[PDB]
Ligand binder design. Structure first.
Ligand SMILES: C[n+]1cn([C@@H]2O[C@H](COP(=O)(O)OP(=O)(O)O)[C@@H](O)[C@H]2O)c2nc(N)[nH]c(=O)c21
Length: 177
């Protein structure tokens, strides 16, 4: 078996139609933990790809003990890069995102906390979470390489978690790569 540098945990949360504004993530839960390339596949192969997910469901893959929540102390000062695409057109983007992450392919690897693919009504988004948004140099690098890894050519934005918390209005991208 080929061991990974870091352990990872798959997370999942299917609201089942319930609103996401009330008691958010009260059901988010871990699914599987893996620490080798082979184990990663065995899990990935027997797990619903993004395209098979119902509206409202969220699939996450975080490093070590980090949880898919803004309130997590590890992501307290972080943010995230997002890519949006049509319904059922994120299977590959998500896959490559996972491989690049577990592969420790990023120049500022420490920053990487995990990834989350969100399935919605008329769109699907894949987002990679980072530790320090105040570090513009690192984030710009993470963003560019991520697009490079997924061979994405459209501009993307980085949204600080503190701005995402804004329940009053949509968050404005801090950076764009
Ligand atoms: C990711 N996330 C989402 N929420 C809540 O869930 C809402 C919806 O978040 P979403 O479903 O990720 O975005 P969407 O509805 O545009 O598809 C957010 O506006 C917050 O009210 C969150 N609330 C907390 N406390 N922590 C989180 O990480 C978090």
């Amino acid at each position: 078996a080929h061991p990974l540098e870091n352990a990872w945990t798959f997370w999942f949360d299917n609201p089942q139609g319930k609103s996401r504004q009330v008691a958010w993530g009260s059901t988010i839960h871990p699914i599987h933990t893996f620490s080798t390339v082979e184990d990663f596949w065995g899990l990935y192969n027997n797990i619903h790809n993004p395209s098979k997910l119902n509206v409202g469901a969220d699939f996450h893959c975080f490093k070590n003990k980090i949880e898919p929540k803004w309130e997590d102390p590890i992501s307290a000062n972080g943010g995230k890069w997002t890519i949006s695409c049509g319904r059922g057109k994120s299977d590959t983007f998500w896959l490559h995102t996972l491989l690049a992450m577990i592969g420790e392919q990023f120049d500022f690897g420490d920053e990487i906390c995990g990834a989350v693919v969100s399935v919605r009504q008329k769109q699907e988004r894949v987002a990679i979470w980072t530790k320090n948004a105040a570090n513009e140099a690192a984030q710009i690098s993470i963003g560019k390489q991520w697009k490079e890894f997924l061979d994405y050519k459209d501009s993307i934005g980085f949204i600080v978690h503190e701005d995402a918390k804004r329940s009053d209005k949509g968050p404005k991208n801090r950076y764009t790569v």
